[PDB]
Amino acid sequence: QIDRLITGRLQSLQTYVTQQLIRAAEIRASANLAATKMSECVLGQSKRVD
Amino acid sequence: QIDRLITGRLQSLQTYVTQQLIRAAEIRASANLAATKMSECVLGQSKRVDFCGKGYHLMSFPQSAPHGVVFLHVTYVPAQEKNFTTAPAICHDGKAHFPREGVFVSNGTHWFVTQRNFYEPQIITTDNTFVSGNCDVVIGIVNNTVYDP
Amino acid sequence: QIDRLITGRLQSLQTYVTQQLIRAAEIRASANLAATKMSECVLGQSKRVDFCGKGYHLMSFPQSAPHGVVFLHVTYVPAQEKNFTTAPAICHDGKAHFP
Amino acid sequence: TKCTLKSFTVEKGIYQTSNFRVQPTESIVRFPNITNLCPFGEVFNATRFASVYAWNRKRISNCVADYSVLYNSASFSTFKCYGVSPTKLNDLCFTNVYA
Amino acid sequence: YTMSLGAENSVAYSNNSIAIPTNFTISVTTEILPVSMTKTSVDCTMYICGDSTECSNLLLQYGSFCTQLNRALTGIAVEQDKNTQEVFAQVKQIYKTPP
Amino acid sequence: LTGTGVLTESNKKFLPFQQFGRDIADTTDAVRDPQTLEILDITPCSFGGVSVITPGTNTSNQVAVLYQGVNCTEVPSNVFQTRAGCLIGAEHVNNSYECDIPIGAGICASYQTQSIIAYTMSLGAENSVAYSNNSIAIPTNFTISVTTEILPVSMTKTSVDCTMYICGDSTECSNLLLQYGSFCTQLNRALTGIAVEQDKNTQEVFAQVKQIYKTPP
Numbered sequence A: 001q002i003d004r005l006i007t008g009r010l011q012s013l014q015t016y017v018t019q020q021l022i023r024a025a026e027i028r029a030s031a032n033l034a035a036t037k038m039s040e041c042v043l044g045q046s047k048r049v050d
Numbered sequence B: 001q002i003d004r005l006i007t008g009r010l011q012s013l014q015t016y017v018t019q020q021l022i023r024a025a026e027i028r029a030s031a032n033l034a035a036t037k038m039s040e041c042v043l044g045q046s047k048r049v050d051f052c053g054k055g056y057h058l059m060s061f062p063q064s065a066p067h068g069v070v071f072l073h074v075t076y077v078p079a080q081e082k083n084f085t086t087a088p089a090i091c092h093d094g095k096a097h098f099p100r101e102g103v104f105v106s107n108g109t110h111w112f113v114t115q116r117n118f119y120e121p122q123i124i125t126t127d128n129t130f131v132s133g134n135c136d137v138v139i140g141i142v143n144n145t146v147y148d149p
Numbered sequence C: 001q002i003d004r005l006i007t008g009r010l011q012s013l014q015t016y017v018t019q020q021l022i023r024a025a026e027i028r029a030s031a032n033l034a035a036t037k038m039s040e041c042v043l044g045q046s047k048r049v050d051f052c053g054k055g056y057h058l059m060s061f062p063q064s065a066p067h068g069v070v071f072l073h074v075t076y077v078p079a080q081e082k083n084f085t086t087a088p089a090i091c092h093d094g095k096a097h098f099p
Numbered sequence D: 001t002k003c004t005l006k007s008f009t010v011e012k013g014i015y016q017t018s019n020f021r022v023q024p025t026e027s028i029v030r031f032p033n034i035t036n037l038c039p040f041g042e043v044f045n046a047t048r049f050a051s052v053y054a055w056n057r058k059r060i061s062n063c064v065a066d067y068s069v070l071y072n073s074a075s076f077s078t079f080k081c082y083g084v085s086p087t088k089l090n091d092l093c094f095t096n097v098y099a
Numbered sequence E: 001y002t003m004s005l006g007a008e009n010s011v012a013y014s015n016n017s018i019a020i021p022t023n024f025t026i027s028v029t030t031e032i033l034p035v036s037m038t039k040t041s042v043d044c045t046m047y048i049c050g051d052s053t054e055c056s057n058l059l060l061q062y063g064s065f066c067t068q069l070n071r072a073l074t075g076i077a078v079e080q081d082k083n084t085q086e087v088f089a090q091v092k093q094i095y096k097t098p099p
Numbered sequence F: 001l002t003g004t005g006v007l008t009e010s011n012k013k014f015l016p017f018q019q020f021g022r023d024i025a026d027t028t029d030a031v032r033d034p035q036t037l038e039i040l041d042i043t044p045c046s047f048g049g050v051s052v053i054t055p056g057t058n059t060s061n062q063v064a065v066l067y068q069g070v071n072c073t074e075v076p077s078n079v080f081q082t083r084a085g086c087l088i089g090a091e092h093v094n095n096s097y098e099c100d101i102p103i104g105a106g107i108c109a110s111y112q113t114q115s116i117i118a119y120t121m122s123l124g125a126e127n128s129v130a131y132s133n134n135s136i137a138i139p140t141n142f143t144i145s146v147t148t149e150i151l152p153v154s155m156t157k158t159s160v161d162c163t164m165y166i167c168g169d170s171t172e173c174s175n176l177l178l179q180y181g182s183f184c185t186q187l188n189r190a191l192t193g194i195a196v197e198q199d200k201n202t203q204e205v206f207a208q209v210k211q212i213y214k215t216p217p
């Protein structure tokens, strides 16, 4: 009876870890985007709109 | 015996939820890409190649769609292309020159300066190239005459 | 007692599968990035700074590779730079002008 | 490789089929020096023994007891053991032994 | 101390220095971007159970989750449906008590 | 310590009381001999995957076995080791030219004539292709063409019903699943876009009632 809820909470924690890893991947993608925006806006005048 | 298969199916459902969340992240990324493509193609004429469709962008038109945006891209593709011998830089008595707003294009005996989208033979002048040190560091050295009428 | 460790290792394997799927998604994103970089650097001279390599793009050359594409970017980097005082706009008897 | 690729025509390249783990060839067992032996020679080779009504009770502890020298000796007529095997005497630990 | 955070726009007219290049040097840059991914398969039997028989016997009752994991790793989405392949059946092999 | 590895002489010095040690990754690295009082490093044995060097089945069937990260002194035509391991079934030609089949980590393999040979790659400088006067395609004429492109923006809200998914028309299955907790609610909240909170057990309790009957006297 204890191990049932233990496994349920382990599944919940696995879902939380998956969400955290996806958030980390999105943050790395946003970091790459910020880096290329820096390179294209500060070190040069980009002709791209918006 | 029931809880064993229950845990197995819970692992399967967790894998399904992970796949769904990754799909949602990819859909958000594609939405950001569609937004920036709209901003760069409809509100302006982007000079990027194969960005607002396939070719050089001229004008774009947005169209609504369920869970998506349809773009009507009007462009022109290269009909006939010709291969030319190019060089990274030239050398006219030192002061190696590299091309700006175009590349060096040669037809076999003479070298010209033109952009990579259309073929327009132009004489090499000072207003078309920039000096960069001497003809030692730049790998690839060809001797030509930079006229300036 | 065996099924406890079995469930623990199943959770570990699920975490591993999640990491592998995220890596596959990142690899697909990098493949799309490589495709658009090819299209914007080889089939055209992009005016973007630090996009086709590091500097102002002049010409690019593609090279095959196992599970990847190698790009030979020929560019020029700023050798000597000088700092200058800039202004957002000027004013010559009204009608502010921007560059 | 044909089982890994599930095809009768293998292309030109390198393919990883299985793994290779060097299995342990020998099995070494190291332990510190066997010092501070139990004084079995003091109770077994005693000069003067006591009677059956006034038997001494010598306590043996904090030492390594080598039972192989007692079993491998034809001088003893009876070497019966109760509740323990004579061979596994050197593979067991105790707190205190009375002689 | 309390921050006022009046307006960040005050840095616009701060006459910041902008670096304008003067000379350039031709340089080449080699860049590698991954495109495809090597097909990674998962063997749940050897991963969850390391050289164990009863472990695999107990894992065989957890279902075909390994097939779904492999299909997800290959790029195939997992179907969301009811239990049309797994049944929670029982045989009740318990012996009869002696009268 | 019950491990498995190769014991070799070390150059470090332990304290007069420290028996064994470990690396930063919390793994046994060295141990002092209990009799010689000498430190012996512990290195995990050769762990690598095998590889088959095949020049395609359309040309010939002569292949070479490639071992990764192992030495042929412990592995049970021509036997010779390389930078990436040991390669069985090839030659050791000292020549050097362009790479044909990259076996990994330097050395490459190729098919030459009737046998498979090996050669060391120099990889001097990739910059030599810059002045290789490569052909660049310059367009001359163009044709107006239209392209329709569709990019997904939003996603249809997908909900998960754990009751019907884990239990297909079963009563006892659902009765046993009801004790696993409210994980389905967290899964639905994660699928909708709401992050899962990380806290203690403020809603689930591991309580028990002990409904066991009393034994007859």
Ligand SMILES: *[C@@H]1O[C@H](CO)[C@@H](O[C@@H]2O[C@H](CO)[C@@H](O[C@@H]3O[C@H](CO)[C@@H](O)[C@H](O)[C@@H]3O)[C@H](O)[C@H]2NC(C)=O)[C@H](O)[C@H]1NC(C)=O
Pocket (backbone or CB within 6 Å): D033, F035, F036
């Ligand atoms: C545990 O026992 C080992 C037995 O090898 C000890 O190693 C050896 O110890 C001796 C005595 O300190 C070292 O000196 C040698 O003594 C012998 C006998 O007197 C002599 O014939 C040799 O010429 C040498 O002088 C010896 O170098 C050393 N190593 C070896 C390989 O014999 C060890 O010291 C003992 N440890 C403890 C904590 O008692």
Ligand SMILES: *[C@@H]1O[C@H](CO)[C@@H](O[C@@H]2O[C@H](CO)[C@@H](O)[C@H](O)[C@H]2NC(C)=O)[C@H](O)[C@H]1NC(C)=O
Pocket (backbone or CB within 6 Å): D040, D041, D042, D044, D045, D069
């Ligand atoms: C009591 O003394 C006898 C006599 O020395 C010991 O027997 C010897 O044991 C050693 C052990 O290897 C042998 O090498 C000798 O050959 C034995 N000698 C004889 C005459 O048998 C005996 O071990 C002693 N008792 C104890 C408990 O140590």
Ligand SMILES: *[C@@H]1O[C@H](CO)[C@@H](O)[C@H](O)[C@H]1NC(C)=O
Pocket (backbone or CB within 6 Å): B081, B082, B083, F135, F137
């Ligand atoms: C230009 O070079 C490419 C590179 O392979 C080739 O496919 C194409 O046919 C060439 N075009 C001409 C006109 O030679």
Ligand SMILES: *[C@@H]1O[C@H](CO)[C@@H](O)[C@H](O)[C@H]1NC(C)=O
Pocket (backbone or CB within 6 Å): B107, B108, B109, B110
């Ligand atoms: C190349 O261009 C030059 C410049 O117009 C021209 O004189 C020449 O005939 C062309 N063809 C060759 C093969 O040089």
Ligand SMILES: *[C@@H]1O[C@H](CO)[C@@H](O)[C@H](O)[C@H]1NC(C)=O
Pocket (backbone or CB within 6 Å): B131, B132, B133, B134, C080, E022, E023, E024
């Ligand atoms: C650097 O730029 C200055 C600007 O006039 C020029 O005089 C000088 O020759 C340049 N040096 C090199 C090495 O390009």
Ligand SMILES: *[C@@H]1O[C@H](CO)[C@@H](O)[C@H](O)[C@H]1NC(C)=O
Pocket (backbone or CB within 6 Å): B141, B142, B143
């Ligand atoms: C260009 O001229 C220099 C100076 O005489 C000479 O050293 C070099 O070899 C010439 N290069 C070519 C390609 O003719």
Ligand SMILES: *[C@@H]1O[C@H](CO)[C@@H](O)[C@H](O)[C@H]1NC(C)=O
Pocket (backbone or CB within 6 Å): C081, C082, C083, E017, E019
């Ligand atoms: C220009 O400003 C940057 C900003 O810190 C500084 O690093 C650099 O040294 C400055 N260059 C000159 C020539 O003053």
Ligand SMILES: *[C@@H]1O[C@H](CO)[C@@H](O)[C@H](O)[C@H]1NC(C)=O
Pocket (backbone or CB within 6 Å): E014, E015, E016, E017
């Ligand atoms: C603006 O010019 C002043 C005057 O030299 C200077 O002190 C200040 O640092 C400049 N602001 C910048 C460089 O952002």
Ligand SMILES: *[C@@H]1O[C@H](CO)[C@@H](O)[C@H](O)[C@H]1NC(C)=O
Pocket (backbone or CB within 6 Å): F071, F072, F073, F081
């Ligand atoms: C491989 O291991 C053996 C062990 O006997 C050793 O003799 C040999 O020198 C090793 N080779 C390399 C290249 O490390």
Ligand SMILES: *[C@@H]1O[C@H](CO)[C@@H](O)[C@H](O)[C@H]1NC(C)=O
Pocket (backbone or CB within 6 Å): F132, F133, F134, F135
């Ligand atoms: C450079 O020109 C030579 C001479 O025709 C040719 O053989 C070689 O293939 C060219 N290099 C290229 C096209 O990369």
